[PDB]
Amino acid sequence: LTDLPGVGPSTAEKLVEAGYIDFMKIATATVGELTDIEGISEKAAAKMIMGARDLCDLGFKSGIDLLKQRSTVWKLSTSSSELDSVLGGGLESQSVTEFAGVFGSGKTQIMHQSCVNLQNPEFLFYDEEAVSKGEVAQPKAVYIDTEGTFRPERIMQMAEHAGIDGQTVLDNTFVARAYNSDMQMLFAEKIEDLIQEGNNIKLVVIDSLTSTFRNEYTKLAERQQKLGRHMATLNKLADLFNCVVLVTNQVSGHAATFRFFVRKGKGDKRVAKLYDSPHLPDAEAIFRITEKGIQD
Numbered sequence: 378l379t380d381l382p383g384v385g386p387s388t389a390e391k392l393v394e395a396g397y398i399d400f401m402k403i404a405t406a407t408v409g410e411l412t413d414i415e416g417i418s419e420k421a422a423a424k425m426i427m428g429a430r431d432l433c434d435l436g437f438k439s440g441i442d443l444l445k446q447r448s449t450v451w452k453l454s455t456s457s458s459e460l461d462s463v464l465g466g467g468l469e470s471q472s473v474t475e476f477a478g479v480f481g482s483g484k485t486q487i488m489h490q491s492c493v494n495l496q497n498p499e500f501l502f503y504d505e506e507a508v509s510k511g512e513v514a515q516p517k518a519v520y521i522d523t524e525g526t527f528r529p530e531r532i533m534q535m536a537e538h539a540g541i542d543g544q545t546v547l548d549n550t551f552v553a554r555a556y557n558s559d560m561q562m563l564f565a566e567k568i569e570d571l572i573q574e575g576n577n578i579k580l581v582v583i584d585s586l587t588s589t590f591r592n593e594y595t596k597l598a599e600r601q602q603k604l605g606r607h608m609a610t611l612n613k614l615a616d617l618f619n620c621v622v623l624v625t626n627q628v629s630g631h632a633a634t635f636r637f638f639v640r641k642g643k644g645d646k647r648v649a650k651l652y653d654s655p656h657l658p659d660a661e662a663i664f665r666i667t668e669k670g671i672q673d
């Protein structure tokens with residue numbers, strides 16, 4: 378931190394005690410959030426922010442640099458060929474992907490399958506010139522469980538059928554049981570704390586995203602508010618930590634970059650329809666849910 382303009386030893390200590398330890402977080406901060414640190418003037422805040430942006434080279438980009446930026450996005454396989462294709466390769470890092478659907482359509486299964494897949498190195502697709510092997514090494518997942526449906530047994534079974542070690546998935550997946558929207562939001566805000574403690578968080582799951590909010594603000598206005606702050610935190614986390622963020626929506630409006638509607642097909646079959654994305658056509662993906670997890 379002292380490399381930053383105006384920042385000396387004591388200011389660097391204050392910054393780290395407020396949780397601002399990397400340049401990117403400072404470069405993307407508002408003067409307000411830094412001045413609210415006290416001991417940190419408004420002029421010093423504007424100076425270190427400008428210095429941070431410069432060290433992170435955050436200005437206008439054009440031509441080939443536009444392609445380079447896009448190449449920093451890596452993708453996580455879903456174990457379904459069809460679903461991966463419709464996704465343009467797999468679940469994207471630096472974006473929030475939402476799976477909505479009726480009860481039993483497979484939302485929680487996909488969340489569990491993703492936690493397992495993260496532990497199979499060959500299921501993370503990336504361009505080696507834009508994403509280094511070290512960036513996706515020892516990846517870990519965070520599962521914020523709002524329903525009480527996380528099942529370690531299911532993790533073990535899906536891992537076994539994929540030929541990877543179940544205990545290893547459990548060891549590298551943090552689960553937070555949230556009973557209301559305050560806990561759900563605080564847990565999401567605390568993921569930055571796990572990352573600074575050395576955990577390479579690369580997958581964040583929120584199952585469910587809207588249940589607590591609907592149960593508490595059954596007030597679309599405020600609800601939408603609190604939910605908007607929650608969504609901004611998820612989108613920022615995805616961008617800044619080059620992380621895949623997945624959320625489920627139990628349906629019977631907000632900022633997701635990819636949105637699916639999953640429905641039941643015959644017995645085993647499920648259909649996932651991508652209905653919103655910034656660059657892909659609407660398309661349907663047929664898959665199945667079996668003891669092996671998600672397949673086809």
Ligand SMILES: Nc1ncnc2c1ncn2[C@@H]1O[C@H](COP(=O)(O)OP(=O)(O)O)[C@@H](O)[C@H]1O
Nearest residue numbers: 478479480481482483484485486487666667668
């Ligand atoms: N061990 C398993 N073997 C085969 N199918 C399973 C297994 N566990 C769960 N499923 C399937 O997943 C369905 C439930 O999916 P789930 O993810 O919980 O739905 P949602 O979260 O959308 O309400 C089940 O009813 C069952 O068909």
Ligand SMILES: [Mg+2]
Nearest residue numbers: 471472615616
């Ligand atoms: Mg993004």
Ligand SMILES: [Mg+2]
Nearest residue numbers: 484485524526
């Ligand atoms: Mg569920």
Ligand code: NA
Nearest residue numbers: 379380381384
């Ligand atoms: Na300095």
Ligand SMILES: [W+6]
Nearest residue numbers: 587591597630
């Ligand atoms: W609603």
Ligand SMILES: [W+6]
Nearest residue numbers: 591592594595
């Ligand atoms: W409602």
Ligand SMILES: [W+6]
Nearest residue numbers: 591594595629
């Ligand atoms: W209603």
Ligand SMILES: [W+6]
Nearest residue numbers: 594595596597
């Ligand atoms: W209504």
Ligand SMILES: [W+6]
Nearest residue numbers: 591595596597
């Ligand atoms: W409503």
Ligand SMILES: [W+6]
Nearest residue numbers: 595597629630
């Ligand atoms: W309505």
Ligand SMILES: [W+6]
Nearest residue numbers: 591627628629
């Ligand atoms: W509804």
Ligand SMILES: [W+6]
Nearest residue numbers: 591627628629
């Ligand atoms: W309704």
Ligand SMILES: [W+6]
Nearest residue numbers: 591595628629
């Ligand atoms: W409703």
Ligand SMILES: [W+6]
Nearest residue numbers: 595597628629
């Ligand atoms: W309605």
Ligand SMILES: [W+6]
Nearest residue numbers: 597628629630
């Ligand atoms: W509605």
Ligand SMILES: [W+6]
Nearest residue numbers: 628630638652
């Ligand atoms: W609609």
